[PDB]
Design a protein around this ligand. Sequence first.
Ligand SMILES: [Fe+3]
Ligand SMILES: [Mn+2]
Length: 281
Amino acid sequence: TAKKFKVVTTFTIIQDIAQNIAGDVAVVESITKPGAEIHDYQPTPRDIVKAQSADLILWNGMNLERWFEKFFESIKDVPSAVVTAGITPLPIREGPYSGIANPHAWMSPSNALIYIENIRKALVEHDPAHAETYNRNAQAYAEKIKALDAPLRERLSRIPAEQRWLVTSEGAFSYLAKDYGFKEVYLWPINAEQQGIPQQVRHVIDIIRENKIPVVFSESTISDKPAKQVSKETGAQYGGVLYVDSLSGEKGPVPTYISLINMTVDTIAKGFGQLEHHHHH
Ligand SMILES: [Fe+3]
Ligand SMILES: [Mn+2]
């Protein structure tokens, strides 16, 4: 046993999925650290050395990592593989990135099955000595992912169809919302330096009032102030922080991809539940 196969990923969600497929035969590390904003990340000297020492670099594609193309020119002789081949993209419909794909495809557990297949394929090609282990681990992990669907639908099952409105800060939840029959409302379509957010906050305030939507959310890598501003003006609850663009650290609340799907869905469902402060009417 010499130095293992080294895989570097752009961000933490892919790192955790890949590390489950790799098991103990490869080391998988993320360029961005937990909590860091991933769309407009600015790579550092540490990041170049890490990628340059890898045997394989994995990235999302779908224009997620706006920094990756420039970064990857500084890497010599390290193969890269996008993990989203075969994903059916949803478009960004408004704002300066209209017509660019929504990149957050991993928020659908059924899409995670496609991520798994693509990562498995790349590991098997680039580290064939461990092909049997990658295949066995990919199959076992896909089984765990498939087992999420029914309990996730159960958690959300008490919100009738017309009330299934998911109001978040970044429009990062479109793939999850489509799989579970939610209508999405966002404060900005995709993370970026951009115009138009104050007007969209006013727009979203109007939608929440019209439809009596009870809860709004923020996400773990961006500011909660606009969501709190919506809560103040509408009387909707601030439902707390959802996880989409990053895991937490290994000793935090969202250490794994599976914990990210579970906690995000549980936090959404808690926002619609009536189990707060009760009196005897
Ligand atoms: Fe995002
Ligand atoms: Mn880990």
